[PDB]
Symmetry: D2
Subunit: 462 residues, 4 copies
């Protein structure tokens, strides 16, 4: 109750049985070894899953089917995928201003990228569930059990806060569903009006230190927008946009509890993970025979897999063959995360081998993860130039092969933070201390994220 | 050890407070006495309000502006208001199937009423917040403090559950936002497809015991639908519908904590209650000098006031003057609930007097509240025939005066419950015991709610 | 001195001839004997053809391609063909009011048939070229060479006017192009507004002597229309309609001079007759080895063949094989004209036999040609009841076979003439003398044509 | 008949009386002196007018009302007017290829100008009636009676052909209506598809000698077009365009016979000149008290007046006050034709005085008429550079005053003629002899016309 700053929730007082085959397949998948799982008691986990099994889902199957159709276009070279948001959402910052700000920042980039790509952009936020992270060490630099995101434990640097708390599963859901509600309301009610979003971009050009550099493209966009009105098709489709929800599928207690069975109205019933529209499997959890990859094989959602510098062409093909066994364009995204100094050399053989299979994956560039270093001032950071250069090298790789550079996956925020070095604002090592607010990796701030969109539109325009 | 789990709350950020001048005005309004308020401690109420003041809102201002525009159209005789859902929502029934069924039931009625009215229907659900009710006595038949709805206490007949627990404010918010999220998802992704909804209507006609009576009208609607395809009309606006959220604004700790200031872009900034799109004030809390009416004066949302058989023309005029001071059509809805045997006599003088003010209110009929009685078998119930008859009389009143019968307000569910007597299923006093599931008043079940829509369509066509 | 004026022609440019290979094929086809051809001199015919070969066409190939696609839909049971207009157009009646009235009459029928059929209506006018007819005898009751239509000779009962004058080919072209221009203007600028057309229908119901009989259906259509507005459907496709031009391809000097080659962009280049969108071959010129059928084989336009009571199943199959060699659905329409007393007997074996070919033709009912008789008062007339009854029987035939009753072909005008007996106006033999204006067969007047549409809508609904 | 190469047309065998006031006003207007009229016999003129009074009109009133609404937008600074086509249409070149070519050339310019202006372009062809011209001398340089266009006499240099022949009035109508039919068919059936038209422009850029100069803008346009598809509004409005018909209202026998009275459905009945959508009064016929200006005051069509170098600010205001007496934006266009060496000096005082009246005229630049000279090789010609420079000076005039440069009026053709000197093809005095085909003034060829559009788009983009 209020006295204890808690909400009391019944468990008992129920659930339809899965078709026998899905039950068998789901059980087999979750029996496999699973890295990076929280270490809380099984009985407490079960009680929380029982609560999540009967909540209203964050997403619904027909939206995920629509998303799959739109990603199929990306895979075929007829659309571009933009995925972005916080490295780690926090319960504390899950507020209207912060959510609106991140949605705005993604929409601003999307305008620029839609124009530069000359094709639709599929817009996927890291939001409404990006509450869990993996760690390479279980003890961090202060001697505390590592923070693993708010679905698992607390960011505060004290031991009690770092204990793995299963009640955070139900907390992740409440925060996710509330954020998703707002994302839906904002995108349908005026925040995603193309004209309004573009006006924000014009303001950026007017006030940025390198605005002169981006002015010409910004004017071209503006004239492109006015052309639509001139031609008498400035219609309803300019007033709204679809922003999909994504996160890393990390905590299997959470993902399994958010599974729901489709109606079967279209095709036979399948399992959908309704905690999001699409999810990805990270570098530390992509064991080929592990539980995450197997869980991904059982769900109908579009999925991605992060591929780092030790990836081989052969293992990549094995991911394709296990995760896209029916050859459905768009079902699988392969994220490229090699570091800017390595992408030009490591990616081509992977791409060639995968293309030779006849499957159509989306090739997406994750510039930021492979380019993180430590500042002299003691902050985890990334240089803007390295981020840009990885996306550049990724484009060059695809141009040379004739394949489709399908999208990017970035960590950004609508906040004016000081987390990544460089950009037109020339964020320095000493600037970092001003507003270093991320609960995990360093994000592009709103200006740097928009600037990146401008630079990438130029790579698109070639 | 017992079967609940405590979910920890806290984690407040500091968001800036509402402006001083509007808080000054708000404090003056809430100094007025409030009936029917929970009896929990102020310091606890304050702490929970503080939580709610920083959460993502359930609705956003531009939606409410848009609803106000649609309601202006109703007030002018150019659209029809349909408002419906559970008497009392409960936390344990706030599930995907129950929410989906209720949205479905409302949509089914809306197809038939749209055709029958030959004009747009504004679709407002009682949902995502109808978690509080008044009571007449503080002591129920079992010797317990009364159930006041899940925002205040628990339905279970035990003392501990019946204590007023302000942590339920936060639980109510979580449940509301989760439900609204789902309502948004369903209505934008296919549940609200006109063709799908109408197929469900065709199945009702094929299987209802009185199908034969509704067949002609249903075939005519079907032919209306096919005519649209035959004329090649751009059919996107047939794929989705807007369902707004409403509830009784009862618990002022909740409503006041959900107050937000709109951004400057939309014609300056005003106070909206973002716990819903529209709210109404009930019979027991509409004291002209009380805090509920004062609260309604201060917010920009459209509002309604329930008007029972003790209402006088003069008091009605006073509502108009306090609540529509700027003569904005549709800002105020007066909801008539006089009982079928009294409506034809009591309503006309109220209408004439209000019409003479020069203001344009929406006249909405609530035919279920004034027609409740006790079955021999001991269940609170309502006879279907009396519900229909009150709507009939409501229409007669307006026809005779040349005023617009503007809408209905009903309690319904998509479940096949046995709560109201009659309908084509001829539910008897004996049947009531089968599925009497309501946590408060008896609801029209899914078949009865649809049947009523057919009967009201014929009143609209006459 | 007499009251005509000579308008000089000549002024040929040199446009390149049609390709040699297609001219070679065309010359071979037109070496076949042609019935019912004007008897003017070849050198004069050649000079006028030469004029026509370089004029701007009445229609263009992409319109005819689009009509063919719409006719494919009719052939497949997913649309309905309505074809109607004057029996014989005349040069002196080719005025704005008469053309507007005829377009109006056709549109009025089309609203009612679109609603009744619950599917698109392809609207084809007999207009902009129906300037030629056959005759049985070369000598009429007045001892003169027969009137053959204004493309060949004059209606006036005098010898000089009755001589076959090839300058009328050019006059026919000028009149056709002027009429088509007006049909295009009217249908794109407001005459073909669904709401306006339906208002005219409401006025007919309010004033017809049998209005009461049609009131229910008309109100239902009205409510169908308002439902579209109520559902907020994008209403641009309600503002205009397509009316195609058709006539009997009779005068081969005219049809051959109006042949054009389509440009390369639309799937290679073929021969179209650009004097109209679709043409049909009449009873007297459908010799299987004659030039009319051969001409129809060579052109890409959709074509029709009239089928009277002497038709055999086997001959019908031969039309199918000569005229639909590539099995393109809707390319061929077979138009039944068997008389109401014979249709139920004679049509079924033709249909079964044609259906068994595997080809998809449009089955269209011409209910006026086989039901003509002579009034005591000395006027060629038709009884409305017999016209309706032939359509009735046509529908019965198709229902019994499970085939698609595809359309109707009627002779109508928007004028209030007195040419056919019966209808709600109960036109009598005596009334015929009031306004018997047709230059050939008796037409349904505007009221009768609309009444028929209502009756045929009820056949479609049954 | 054919023998005489003539079509014989009845006159007798009728016309509703005008409202008394329109009759009076029309009579008063035509009783005023009229310059530049043909000198044929009054009785023969009358017979031809009698024929034209009952033909199907070239345009219909609702189209002219729509055009007036679109021109109102131009006048208000929210659209741009492009008007263009042959200096003089000829009966001999009134062919499909020539009409399609001129329509194409206008559409190509319009794409470029729509993009450059960032607003809609109203597209008005000089077509379907531009068959009459004024002359300063009645005897030309060969001693023959001057050619005055094909509605009056024959271009051929012999005396008999130069006689004024009233039958040409009926000939102008037949040619006009046929051309209009084709313009309608082309613009509604695929020729005016934005994507197709723009593809022609890309081909021009690829093959023009100065294509490199226009490449950047052409690519920007292309990306603007693809942006519309990317945003999911590449809709129906991109598939067609409206091309309006215009000519100089010169021959009053023709214009008066093409007058028709509106239905009065919208407003009281007015006279519309249905020989075109809009007409203008030239320099030699704009006598303030003459019949042309007075005729223009009686018709409801939008009208223009050409203003040459002797115009004064005071007389311009008098044209505005007589021709736009009700202050209807768009009703009146003032065409600027001062020569490139004079426009910067003569236009500003005219514009200032007219703006001071509070009326909103469209200011349109006619670059070509004021910049004609004689080549050494003996051809009437114009230098491209002078044409461009007049439009430049016109823009500078309006920029300096803050007024709207509303449009251009040019003489062009889709043919590859050699009539105007210069352009990227660098047409020289000796080149002129290659394809000097105009029946009157020298036209921009297809390439020069498109090039001008590019240069003007840059003036628009400023
Ligand atoms: N994000 C805050 C506020 C909050 C409390 N309960 C919630 C339920 C749903 C959404 C947000 C909240 C928290 O989790 O403490
Ligand atoms: N709905 C389109 C266009 C659009 C509207 N708002 C946007 C914001 C950003 C980018 C595109 C848009 C899309 O999503 O592509
Ligand atoms: N959530 C269950 C699986 C499950 C059982 N029944 C279901 C119905 C629908 C979706 C999932 C399920 C688990 O973790 O094992
Ligand atoms: N409605 C159930 C389940 C639940 C728990 N927490 C929630 C948060 C949001 C929505 C639903 C829930 C309850 O309130 O006990
Ligand atoms: N969007 C329209 C049509 C519509 C779509 N789905 C519906 C369901 C019920 C009624 C109408 C509709 C409306 O809300 O009126
Ligand atoms: N239809 C009339 C009037 C007319 C003369 N020439 C025309 C040319 C086109 C249209 C109509 C006409 C006729 O043919 O005598
Ligand atoms: N364009 C649609 C609807 C329509 C517009 N005007 C009409 C007149 C009659 C019938 C239908 C229509 C059609 O042709 O079907
Ligand atoms: N333009 C040519 C061809 C032609 C003859 N008669 C016509 C009638 C209408 C249109 C064109 C023509 C001419 O006037 O000689
Ligand atoms: N219909 C729009 C767009 C358009 C279609 N085709 C065109 C050709 C040229 C210019 C514009 C267009 C317009 O007329 O503006
Ligand atoms: N054309 C006639 C005027 C006229 C008489 N009746 C009309 C009816 C409609 C339009 C014009 C008229 C003239 O030249 O004097
Ligand atoms: Cl199970
Ligand atoms: Cl008159
Ligand atoms: Mn209730
Ligand atoms: Mn006939």
């Amino acid at each position: 109750g209020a006295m204890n700053w808690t909400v009391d929730i019944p468990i008992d007082q129920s659930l339809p049985p899965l078709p026998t085959d899905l039950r068998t397949r789901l059980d087999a998948a979750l029996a496999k070894p699973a890295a990076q799982q929280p270490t809380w008691p099984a009985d407490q986990a079960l009680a929380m899953r029982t609560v999540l099994e009967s909540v209203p889902p964050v997403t619904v199957p027909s939206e995920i089917v629509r998303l799959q159709e739109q990603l199929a276009q990306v895979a075929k070279g007829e659309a571009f995928l933009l995925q972005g948001g916080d490295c780690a959402e926090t319960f504390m910052d899950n507020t209207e201003p912060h959510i609106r700000g991140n949605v705005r920042a993604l929409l601003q980039m999307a305008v620029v990228l839609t124009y530069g790509a000359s094709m639709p952009v599929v817009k996927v936020a890291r939001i409404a569930g990006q509450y869990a992270k993996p760690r390479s060490a279980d003890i961090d630099a202060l001697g505390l059990r590592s923070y693993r995101g708010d679905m698992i434990n607390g960011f505060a640097p004290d031991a009690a806060a770092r204990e793995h708390d299963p009640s955070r599963l139900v907390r992740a859901y409440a925060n996710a569903s509330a954020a998703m509600n707002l994302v839906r309301a904002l995108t349908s009610s005026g925040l995603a009006s193309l004209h309004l979003v573009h006006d924000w971009n014009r303001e950026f050009v007017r006030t940025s230190p390198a605005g002169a550099r981006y002015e010409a493209l910004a004017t071209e966009i503006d004239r492109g927008l006015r052309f639509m009105s001139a031609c008498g098709v400035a219609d309803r489709n300019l007033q709204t946009a679809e922003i999909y929800a994504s996160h890393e599928a990390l905590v299997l207690d959470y993902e399994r509890a958010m599974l729901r069975l489709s109606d079967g109205d279209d095709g036979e019933p399948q399992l959908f993970d309704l905690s999001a529209h699409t999810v990805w499997i990270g570098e530390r959890t992509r064991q080929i025979d592990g539980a995450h990859i197997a869980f991904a094989q059982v769900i109908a959602n579009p999925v991605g897999v992060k591929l780092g510098p030790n990836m081989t062409p052969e293992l990549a093909v094995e991911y394709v063959e296990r995760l896209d066994p029916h050859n459905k364009p768009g079902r699988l995204t392969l994220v490229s995360r090699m570091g800017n100094h390595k992408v030009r050399d490591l990616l081509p053989p992977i791409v060639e081998k995968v293309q030779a299979t006849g499957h159509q994956v989306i090739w997406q560039c994750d510039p930021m993860h492979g380019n993180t270093h430590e500042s002299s001032t003691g902050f985890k950071t990334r240089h803007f130039d390295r981020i840009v250069d990885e996306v550049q090298g990724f484009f060059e790789v695809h141009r040379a092969l004739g394949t489709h550079p399908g999208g990017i996956h970035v960590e950004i925020t609508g906040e004016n933070v000081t987390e990544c070095l460089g950009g037109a604002q020339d964020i320095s090592e000493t600037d970092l201390a001003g507003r270093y607010e991320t609960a995990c990796d360093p994000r592009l701030n709103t200006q740097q994220s928009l600037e990146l969109a401008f630079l990438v539109a130029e790579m698109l325009r070639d």
